[PDB]
Amino acid sequence: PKPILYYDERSPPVRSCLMLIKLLDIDVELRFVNLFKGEQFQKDFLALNPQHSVPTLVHGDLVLTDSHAILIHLAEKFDEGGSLWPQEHAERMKVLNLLLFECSFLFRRDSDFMSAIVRQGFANVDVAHHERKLTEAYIIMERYLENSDFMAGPQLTLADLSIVTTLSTVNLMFPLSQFPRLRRWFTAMQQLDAYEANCSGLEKLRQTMESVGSFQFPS
Amino acid sequence: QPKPILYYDERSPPVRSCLMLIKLLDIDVELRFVNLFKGEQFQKDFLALNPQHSVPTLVHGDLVLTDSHAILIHLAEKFDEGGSLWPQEHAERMKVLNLLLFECSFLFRRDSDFMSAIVRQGFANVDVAHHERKLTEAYIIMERYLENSDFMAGPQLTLADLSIVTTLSTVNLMFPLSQFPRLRRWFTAMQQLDAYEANCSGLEKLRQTMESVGSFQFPSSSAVV
Numbered sequence: 001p002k003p004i005l006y007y008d009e010r011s012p013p014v015r016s017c018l019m020l021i022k023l024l025d026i027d028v029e030l031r032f033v034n035l036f037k038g039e040q041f042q043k044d045f046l047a048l049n050p051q052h053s054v055p056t057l058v059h060g061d062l063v064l065t066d067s068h069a070i071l072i073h074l075a076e077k078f079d080e081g082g083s084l085w086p087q088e089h090a091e092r093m094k095v096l097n098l099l100l101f102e103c104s105f106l107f108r109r110d111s112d113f114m115s116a117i118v119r120q121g122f123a124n125v126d127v128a129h130h131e132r133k134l135t136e137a138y139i140i141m142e143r144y145l146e147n148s149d150f151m152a153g154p155q156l157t158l159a160d161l162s163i164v165t166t167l168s169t170v171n172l173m174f175p176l177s178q179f180p181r182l183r184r185w186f187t188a189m190q191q192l193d194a195y196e197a198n199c200s201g202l203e204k205l206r207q208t209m210e211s212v213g214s215f216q217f218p219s
Numbered sequence: 220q221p222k223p224i225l226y227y228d229e230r231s232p233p234v235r236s237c238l239m240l241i242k243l244l245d246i247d248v249e250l251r252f253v254n255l256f257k258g259e260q261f262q263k264d265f266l267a268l269n270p271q272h273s274v275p276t277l278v279h280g281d282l283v284l285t286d287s288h289a290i291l292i293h294l295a296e297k298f299d300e301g302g303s304l305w306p307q308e309h310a311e312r313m314k315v316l317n318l319l320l321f322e323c324s325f326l327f328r329r330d331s332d333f334m335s336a337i338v339r340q341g342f343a344n345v346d347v348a349h350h351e352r353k354l355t356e357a358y359i360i361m362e363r364y365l366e367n368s369d370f371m372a373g374p375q376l377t378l379a380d381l382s383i384v385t386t387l388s389t390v391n392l393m394f395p396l397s398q399f400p401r402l403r404r405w406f407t408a409m410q411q412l413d414a415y416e417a418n419c420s421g422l423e424k425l426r427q428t429m430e431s432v433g434s435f436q437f438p439s440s441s442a443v444v
């Protein structure tokens with residue numbers, strides 16, 4: 001059977017999966033789970049995925065509850081021979097390492113910041129604190145890109161798909177003005193046909209956050 | 220080929236996960252200590268190697284891995300080539316990968332949040348009830364996984380069990396497993412593995428350090444032993 005993707009396109013990791021699906025022409029059944037209504041806590045979804053996490057992919061009996069597993073699974077199933085998930089071991093480990101940086105560092109700090117706006121309203125958020133946290137991710141990422149067209153090397157990989165969606169999300173608030181490599185890379189990512197899958201959800205997130213947080217992002 | 224170099228502090232559970240795999244596979248590695256409580260992960264030379272200032276960090280030739288789950292997979296592919304720890308069949312491997320990411324994003328994150336709070340605030344000043352809820356939720360999720368197979372990712376031992384057991388033993392210093400029969404049975408089974416010996420020393424050192432810097436005593440009845 002085809003994969004089923006439980007999604008809310010406002011979430012960056014969801015958009016990373018949407019980008020890969022568009023890049024690889026994968027036929028997937030989308031099922032919307034409204035994160036801002038807490039539908040990930042519905043009894044049937046909790047039974048499927050007690051982590052109540054989105055995206056979730058059901059492919060046959062396989063239930064993937066993390067976007068980085070979904071990206072790797074879809075690349076191995078639908079992009080054999082591709083560069084997104086390289087065949088060479090060292091290159092693949094570099095991509096894997098960056099996917100985990102996105103999980104544990106970039107996305108974690110983005111989600112901490114954006115979740116704080118939702119729960120408390122933008123006025124109750126220590127913006128300077130989250131600016132420091134997320135600028136540190138910018139700094140690390142700028143150094144990753146030294147003499148490297150893409151995040152993990154000279155070729156587009158899953159690391160770029162995973163990072164670009166979250167970067168575009170953090171960038172709603174914190175500009176890339178001071179990071180020339182990051183800006184150049186982000187601009188290049190925006191020229192890929194597959195990046196169009198990021199656009200709708202990013203704008204929906206901007207509108208939702210500005211409403212629930214009672215503010216405007218800078219812009 | 221150059222021998223792998225592991226930057227480590229055995230008090231960290233993800234470090235102990237790598238130590239367990241290194242012992243299980245008899246991997247010859249060079250160990251370089253980075254004292255997390257002295258702040259040696261912020262030394263200029265280590266920051267230049269890993270700006271995430273985290274252990275474990277592995278250097279193997281020109282490859283620099285800065286996440287324990289990449290280290291586990293890398294070492295499995297180089298030194299357990301064709302083995303079952305990192306399964307050969309695709310779906311089985313994805314299940315392991317999925318649980319490694321649960322450990323990264325959910326279990327270890329909540330463990331580190333709780334332990335970091337103790338270090339920064341002192342135990343008496345930590346919202347323990349808040350973290351008990353956060354970490355009991357991880358117990359619940361792991362119990363759900365174990366209700367459908369003996370090991371975390373299937374019928375046999377995988378990297379997922381190595382990654383999770385170290386952090387589980389750490390959380391369980393504080394929060395008992397009385398209400399989680401599957402997770403107790405699994406934890407007891409992991410404790411019988413010869414490779415589990417690589418978890419014991421760093422877990423005890425962590426208990427000693429936490430109780431001193433946090434100025435408390437873990438509830439002695441919590442730890443499954």
Ligand SMILES: CC1(C)CC(=O)CC(=O)C1
Pocket residue numbers: 010011012035110111114115169205
């Ligand atoms: C809908 C969201 C709040 C989900 C997250 O966890 C972080 C983010 O950037 C968008």
Ligand SMILES: CC1(C)CC(=O)CC(=O)C1
Pocket residue numbers: 230231232255330331334335389425
């Ligand atoms: C030394 C530590 C505090 C490192 C962590 O991040 C979490 C943990 O359990 C032990």
